[PDB]
């Protein structure tokens, strides 16, 4: 055959030479799977001979960042707008809505439901 070494395996699979690799890749392990399994092994800091943390664990940095918001014209504009024709169409849509047990909801549509849902009954109000 060709060989069971990782060099021969990469030559057989036609990897571009010179690419970096993540430590632990083999026939059964790709880079994504290695990352997924190393997540389970994360969580321990690096300590010196006296136990003082010299490198913090994952997402435990203890470094205080600069929490600043830049000036931007996008903060003062309308993110979502809707027209009256579209509102009337959606009101007619809820007017003609029926319930079907064999249909499931997969992704809700972000809508201003307070302007589309019909009002409460007059006795309740």
């Amino acid at each position: 055959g060709t060989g069971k070494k990782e060099k021969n395996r990469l030559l057989r699979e036609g990897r571009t030479p010179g690419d970096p690799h993540v430590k632990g890749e083999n026939f059964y392990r790709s880079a994504k799977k290695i990352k997924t399994l190393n997540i389970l092994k994360e969580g321990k800091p690096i300590r010196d001979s006296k136990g003082k943390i010299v490198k913090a664990a994952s997402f435990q940095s203890k470094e205080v960042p600069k929490a600043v918001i830049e000036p931007n014209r996008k903060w003062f504009t309308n993110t979502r707008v809707i027209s009256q024709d579209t509102l009337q169409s959606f009101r007619e849509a809820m007017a003609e809505k029926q319930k079907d047990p064999y249909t499931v909801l997969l992704k809700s549509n972000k809508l201003p439901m307070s302007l589309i849902r019909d009002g409460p009954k007059l006795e309740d109000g």
Partner: protein, 97 residues
């Protein structure tokens, strides 16, 4: 597909988000917002600074006539030349394809 695109696809390198790649950063020491590159960018920091300390070894190794005020422009020009060389190689390979 260019060389970077093929390398990123093989290595699982994800594209940077539009917020991440913005030309804006917050300078702590001045307490102001500044650009990373371009006109008055942070990559040319200190070229208009009135006072620049220079090391004696680098000043002695510096050629005559050149000043410290153009070192960052020299580095930027070298990086731009390398990037454009890679772009032209990618364009030539795509033209052959």
């Amino acid at each position: 597909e260019t060389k970077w695109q093929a390398f990123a696809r093989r290595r699982g390198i994800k594209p940077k988000t539009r917020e991440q790649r913005r030309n804006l950063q917050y300078n702590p020491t001045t307490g102001q917002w500044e650009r990373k590159w371009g006109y008055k960018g942070a990559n040319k920091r200190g070229e208009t600074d009135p006072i620049i300390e220079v090391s004696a070894a680098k000043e002695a190794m510096r050629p005559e006539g050149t000043s410290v005020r153009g070192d960052k422009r020299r580095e930027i020009r070298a990086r731009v030349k390398k990037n454009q060389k890679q772009m032209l190689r990618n364009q030539r390979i795509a033209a052959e394809k």
